[PDB]
């Protein structure tokens, strides 16, 4: 609300200074809602691709950006 001049992305939610956020550009993401874009798993706060407009894990960025040109 007023207090907390703090907001998610995903769900476009007020996200409490209780709960952790990711603070990318400006914008925030529930600890959760932060999660990825292949597995679609809560990273949190670990080894991990942040994309431009997305997320993606070390495993899971790696296969975006390796040896295959079938996509689609
Ligand atoms: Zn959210
Ligand atoms: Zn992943």
Avoid: L
């Avoid at 999660?35 to 990273?43: D, S, T, V, Y």
């Avoid at 431009?52 to 079938?70: R, T």
């Amino acid at each position: 609300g007023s207090s907390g001049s703090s907001g998610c992305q995903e769900c476009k939610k007020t996200i409490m200074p209780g709960t952790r956020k990711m603070e990318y550009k400006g914008s925030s993401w529930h600890e959760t809602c932060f999660i990825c874009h292949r597995c679609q798993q809560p990273i949190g706060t670990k080894s991990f691709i942040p994309k431009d407009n997305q997320n993606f894990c070390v495993p899971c960025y790696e296969k975006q950006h390796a040896s295959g040109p079938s996509s689609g």
